Amino acid sequence: MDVLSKGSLKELLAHLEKTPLEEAISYRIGTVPYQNVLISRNEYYNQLYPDTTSLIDGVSREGQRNVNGLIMSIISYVVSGSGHYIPNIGFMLLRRSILDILTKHDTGLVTNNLNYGIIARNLTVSKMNCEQRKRMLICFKLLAYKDGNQNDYEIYLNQNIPLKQIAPNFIPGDMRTVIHNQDQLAIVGIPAYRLTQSTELSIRDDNAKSYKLGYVDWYNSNSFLRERSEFNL
Amino acid sequence: ANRATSAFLDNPHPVGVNYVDEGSRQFVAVAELLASKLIDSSRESDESNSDVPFVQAYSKFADDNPRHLRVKTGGKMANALTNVIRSYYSINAPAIVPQVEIDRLASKATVSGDMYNSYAIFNSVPIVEVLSPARTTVSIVGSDRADVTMLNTGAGAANITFNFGQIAETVILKGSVPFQLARLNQPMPAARFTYKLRPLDGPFIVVLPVGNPLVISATAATRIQVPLAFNKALVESGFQTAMNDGLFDIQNVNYYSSFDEFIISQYHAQDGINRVSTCVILGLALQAYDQMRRALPV
Amino acid sequence: ANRATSAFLDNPHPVGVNYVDEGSRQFVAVAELLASKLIDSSRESDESNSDVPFVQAYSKFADDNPRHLRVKTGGKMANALTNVIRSYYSINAPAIVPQVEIDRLASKATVSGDMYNSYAIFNSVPIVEVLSPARTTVSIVGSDRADVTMLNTGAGAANITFNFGQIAETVILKGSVPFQLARLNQPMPAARFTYKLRPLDGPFIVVLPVGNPLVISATAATRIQVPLAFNKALVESGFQTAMNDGLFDIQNVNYYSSFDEFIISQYHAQDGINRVSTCVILGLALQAYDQMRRALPVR
Amino acid sequence: ANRATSAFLDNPHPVGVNYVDEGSRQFVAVAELLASKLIDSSRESDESNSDVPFVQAYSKFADDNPRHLRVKTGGKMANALTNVIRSYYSINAPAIVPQVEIDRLASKATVSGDMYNSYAIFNSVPIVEVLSPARTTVSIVGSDRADVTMLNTGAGAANITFNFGQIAETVILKGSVPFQLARLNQPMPAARFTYKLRPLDGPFIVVLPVGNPLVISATAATRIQVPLAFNKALVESGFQTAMNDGLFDIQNVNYYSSFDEFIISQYHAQDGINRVSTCVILGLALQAYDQMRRALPV
């Protein structure tokens, strides 16, 4: 809910600096993705509603134990709000910040073999909105510039023309680009009053709607409950 | 054996998955309401011999005053309405409109955005399969009125199976000459011109006597939930306008003669009830496109 | 000789003889007027984000205040309109609406029961009979546009007689290839693509040459007196709705694809001048039915 | 070689050359505006219990106060409107109403005479010619939806050329069975159920296999500039009323099933652009004729 509230690149990068990798990994066992299922939407239809499960839903799903699974878990947290179940990663790695994983070599993770096309297909980029895609491209650029793969990122953008139009205008390692960036990346914000307490047909739309409706209540009460446990640590 | 299927029911292409939320539904409803006021204001301006009613309507729709030396394009609302129409048709469309832009355009007027307040009747006839034995030829022509022409060349009478799907509500069959039709495992009645059928009542068997060809004319009615502002006449005009403007020109898509064929074909696809909700929002957007473009041609 | 006739013209079932007086005609007009207010109020409720306009119009229509947990169906007015519609269609349908109920509902709004103020155009093509010789085949398909396919297998040219009835005003005939058509005992003209005909002129003879088949497309237009509130688009939508809901499921009745087919079929039957009056009231009732259900839907 | 053509495209008759000036265009625009108010005043009068809204509307239209025991024809406006419709249809029809009378009736309301601000979509299919080999039979039926039935009795496959003209913007081809179609001197693709074509691309070649006949259904959409008040539902009703009232009965004219067939046929003639301009003015006059005659049936 906090990560989805950020609406600027410099807010999003600041949040990733303070957030450990533990928050991007779920301890719930979940279900296997890419499964054709029938769900109940009784507000609209008497019959069951066909849908397919995906990693970028708001619900935690089982994840693979490879490096590909950990990168997919990070991106899913940014774009959907929840991570995936990857057990026994390691105490040292889980303490590191998300930005440290993406942009630093001291972590001990190797991401040179990652294929950006495969990761996008596994995350169902075709079903992602403009804000979600821009967030995903930010994570790709950070990973590419860490590995010296700047050319591969540009070539990958040439192949996918629609992704090129919405590519973020920031160069990692340059502070000027982050300062002057004017991107809008807020999936969840203070709702327009027109929003109602109604369900949505798709799994993704309903879960995104749930985050939107609960943002006002979370905004008012998160500070005190966080402080009630943070003090005397 | 031979199998005959309707042309428009074949291979429905996947539809878009964007701009179907509550906020985006309101924007389409806002565009339809504001586009209607543009048409009415132009009529009022012509009658009153004053451009003042049109200036207010254009300013609300386009966020800028009309100018004599600037082309009247409808502003940013027109661009957003055009882009969402492209996205609804196919999943391969770019879908580049920001959420901040959509939300600000839904605040121009207050509308519920509910797409289930009413219903509309669609007339496309879905013949999923016509199964004919040997020595018989069967041809299916037309969508709004389906004409099935059958010839029996063999020695004796042949039985022909008709499948109308499980979605259409009612189907009327009319023949050039009286003919016999009955459900599976049912006795055949005396020959008569007209049959009224429920498509959910299994496949239907038609007795084809040897001799002159028998032609069956089929009409069907299906009810699909639509918003209260839905108008089939304006949706049909917008569908034809969008094709001519190139809004539907994307790779790996199917083209239809009318929005009637488009919505029914997507309904009959596997897991087709997912697509029918997106098609209704597309129809409403085309209703806004027709009124806006007729008032502001480009 | 072989005889071919249009499918929709065959065996028109008798229409009802009840609820055709001035009091019942006023009730149908009142229902149509109130149903239009119901559909407009629902639009206003959407634009104002307030249920007051819709509750305001539903109270006039149903004589009851809408309450939550109770399904909105239209009240007693919907019950009367739905059952009166069934009686108009067939004489076998029962008459179950009391006269006290009709009089009370007819007094809700001031309106005239006049059903002959205006006119409408109906496009069903009446082909009463097509008489052909032995060695020819004739097939007729379609109602709005009728395609007559004729094939001659004999040695010489054959004459096909076309009878379009006496009710239709004009009939336009278009052929796939130029063809000759003339009235009875009249010299044949040169081959032409199109013919404009008056059905009262008499039976028409078509020369069918030996060779490829000749297809004649027929379009017809007829004038029927209707009230000013008549809207063809609304009437047709209500006709399909009444069919889907099963109000027209009565014993020994004939089913039509459109209201245009239904009214033309009853016109061409015997005592069709009396039948067409009842059909006009049914069309206005179906217009009220279409607007009522679209305002109050059921999944 | 055999040639097949659409029936409604054959021999378009010359249209009238009068009442096409700015003052005459204003008169038609005034007639449509004042006739529309006549039809709306009737509904408002019935809702209340006063004939005042109708009396005001009729007095403006007919220049005379309505009276009982009189037919209520419509006054001089109704007479003038009837005669100009006759003149538009044919160059043989006389021009009766003087220009002074037209100008006087045009001053009753202040409306612009522009007739080409908006556009409309017309769905008549202009199959100009279908060229077929010796051993093939080709038949064309229909105008709104054109069905071409072709049968090949030869030894091998035959190539059939389709020419849709240059005016239509899009043409959708649907087949009873999947078929192959390609442009001139171009490779044939795999068999497909539906095709979307631009007639300006060029003549198209269809492969006709030996066996059962193949039926292709064609639907077209052409955009024609019209006034904003144009309504296709009202124009078509007036066209039928015009033919039924016997004001299109002139020597050496061609008759059509609908106004849509009339306007597409004139577009494909020699001076297509000039002919269509007159027909659009005829369409608006017919729209006024329908509204006026429904309120005042004589």
Place this chain on the structure above:
Amino acid sequence: RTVADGTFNSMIMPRAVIANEREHFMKTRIDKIEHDLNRSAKQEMMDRQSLAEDYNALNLAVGQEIKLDIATQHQLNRLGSAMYKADHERETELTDLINRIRENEVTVNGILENQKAITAAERADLLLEVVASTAKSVSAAGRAAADGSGVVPVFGPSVANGIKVGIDIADSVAEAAIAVKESGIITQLNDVYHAFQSVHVAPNDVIKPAAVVAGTSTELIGNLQAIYSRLRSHSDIGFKKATVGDVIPNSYMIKPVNSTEYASWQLYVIHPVQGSLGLVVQLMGDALTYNVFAQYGNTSASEFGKTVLTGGATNTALEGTKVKFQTKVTAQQALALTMALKDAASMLSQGELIGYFEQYINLALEPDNLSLQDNMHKYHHLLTSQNSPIDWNYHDEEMHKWLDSRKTTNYDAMQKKDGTVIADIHIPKVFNDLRNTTLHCKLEGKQTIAGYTVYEYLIGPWAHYGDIDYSVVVDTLNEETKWYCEVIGIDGHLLIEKSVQHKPEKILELTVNDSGVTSFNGRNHDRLKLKVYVKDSLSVKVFRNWIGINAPRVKTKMFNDHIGVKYDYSHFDKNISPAHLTLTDLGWHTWDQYNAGNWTNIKP
């Protein structure tokens, strides 16, 4: 179950067998070994002397003789004989399979109607089990295991090894100079052989396309015969291409000189030796495009002919490395997978698209994806059926008319440069088509009845009409022996006895009409079976020749022609015991004259 890594899923991924050099090297070596194991150059060269004597003893008319003493004629003979034997073996297996389906037509019908949701692979196994197929595996591994010696495809480079090329005699007409000239081949023939590799399709592979849509057993048999009619027509064209005096193009794949990880393209050009059409496939990212082009009418400037089917825009001018490969699938099969891969391009990855295509083209390996496998077989049926987008009969006829025109042009060109005698050396007129030319088919026997080994030869079906003669040569250890020949038909058999060794003895004369049928003892037969019984045999050869050179060809039978007329081949499995024959049983005897069994002794 613990969490699943990606290690297992990467192992089972398809590989690019053509682009990778190590994978291509390995399959060329195995293809060479398989060819050398079955056909040995040393044995073939030794056998040349006997075959030359046997062909001379056939006593063909002047201008129709085959002289294996000529190097060019011997080379064309061993390529034709190897090609014909492989095609002949496939027809025998298909005829056996047809009999099994007809015997179990009740249960085969039940499978075809009841089970339609299951894929082609599962339906094929069910059909093969319910019959006594003797080959019950549809997998590639099973097909390779259950393969005979004659089935193995012909490896061109092995046939052309060691042949003298380029003998030059300058203005010498003497007999000694001419004899040296006959001993070698020109460079053109050497290049033709180096780009030759035959393709023969097993009936088990063909059963999957045939049963994907058919609903009756007769529906299935007609589809099987329609496919093999097209396959045998393409085999004849392939052999004709080596006899026209023109080189044959070789299939190649173009890849970028310096490939990029995210921007790589592959262009495949297929030039099947057996067929009249070629296929060009381009892979630019996830986009697949193809263009089917005619292999006839090509000018010297452009290798590609007129394109007959379009599937997008393919650029053949792309610059990059060229890799030569030999396709192991027909043009119909390659097009079927190409059109199926286009539909599933979005679902599949880049590597899967490249790997699945390359494995099928170079290894005849069906893709593992069940959805992709099912779609490819539906397209395969469509291209074979009457509703195909390609008019195969029209294209095959034009290829034949283009090939003999090339033969006339090349023969006339050489008649001007050098003499007519030299022209006859290098472009023989006798060799026209795989089924037209006089050829021999060595017979292998595994069944022995009372000391008599049985050799089976299938007569027909015929793609040409005229008068055709059949001859048999028997080689036996014994100085004196008697061998019996039996020709089986729908009703009865012949039972000839010859008792002649080392010389061809003519057994059967037939006249074939324009429809391909013949009248054998008062009945129309499309094919017959000949069984030769011989004691202590060493080698049995059957010779086939037409009376007229370049006999006219029967039009190819499509699906409708096959189901129109049905012939019973169930009688072909019958056998006789020559040890128990008497004098009265020899000659034409009908079935009614025998009991159940004992087809060798007539009832008394």
